[PDB]
């Protein structure tokens, strides 16, 4: 055949892959965590968005930390040979490096480690996408006026917010990040490489959202999401 190029992940396996959505809305009272009003809007938007990208979507609601770990363990032990990619969406309370089950926290690294190149062989060399709507701390953005491949290769973490910062969720509309992400996937998944889609999400969140609060501490705050890419190739959700 003619000249071949190798710059983009193979996305024409028989299946696009799984999209696991963990939607934690109601937390055990002893944790002292509030209910995450609006997260069902996020979860439904994500389900439809990734359905249209031909992912096998599984929605899970109100999982304990133990159920989160077992679910991700079990999913990492499936045979993904016929799947192009893997997507996991986490919607919950969080801190830097941490996502909350309904009864307590889970280390993000414990979740993602199940899918390391050496621990999930049927996803080796395939893009593993983790999309995280959760706080990464308590800072507020005031804004300004205008040995063959590494085991950590081929992961992408699409964080809703910068390191150390709160993340914003509207109780009526859903979270700023998930809203924008779904809208940009809807508009551009058949046209743009994934990093360029996520860059549009960055701009949409940064420019179109600002908090409104009766509490001066939390009023008029801004947010920028945070793309963390260990991918080794371009990622297009379509193929030729």
């Amino acid at each position: 055949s003619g000249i071949s190029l190798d710059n983009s992940y193979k996305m024409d396996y028989p299946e696009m892959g799984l999209c696991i959505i963990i939607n934690n809305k109601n937390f055990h009272k002893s944790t002292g965590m509030t209910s995450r009003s609006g997260t069902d809007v996020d979860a439904a938007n994500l389900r439809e968005t990734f359905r249209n990208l031909k992912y096998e979507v599984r929605n899970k609601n109100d999982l304990t930390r133990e159920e989160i770990v077992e679910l991700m363990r079990d999913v990492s032990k499936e045979d993904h040979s016929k799947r192009s990619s893997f997507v996991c969406v986490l919607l919950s309370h969080g801190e830097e490096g941490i996502i909350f089950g309904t009864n307590g926290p889970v280390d993000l690294k414990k979740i993602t480690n199940f899918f390391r190149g050496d621990r999930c062989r049927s996803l080796t060399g395939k893009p593993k996408l983790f999309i995280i709507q959760a706080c990464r701390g308590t800072e507020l953005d005031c804004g300004i006026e205008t040995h063959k491949i590494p085991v950590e290769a081929d992961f992408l973490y699409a964080y809703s917010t910068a390191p150390g910062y709160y993340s914003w969720r509207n109780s009526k509309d859903g979270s700023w990040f998930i809203q924008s992400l779904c809208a940009m996937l809807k508009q551009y998944a058949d046209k743009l490489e994934f990093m360029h889609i996520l860059t549009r999400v960055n701009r949409k969140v940064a420019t179109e959202f600002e908090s409104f609060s009766f509490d001066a501490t939390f009023h008029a705050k801004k947010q920028i999401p945070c793309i963390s890419s260990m991918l080794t190739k371009e990622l297009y959700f379509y193929h030729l």
Partner: peptide, 4 residues
């Protein structure tokens, strides 16, 4: 608007 609420924080996570």
């Amino acid at each position: 608007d609420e924080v996570d």
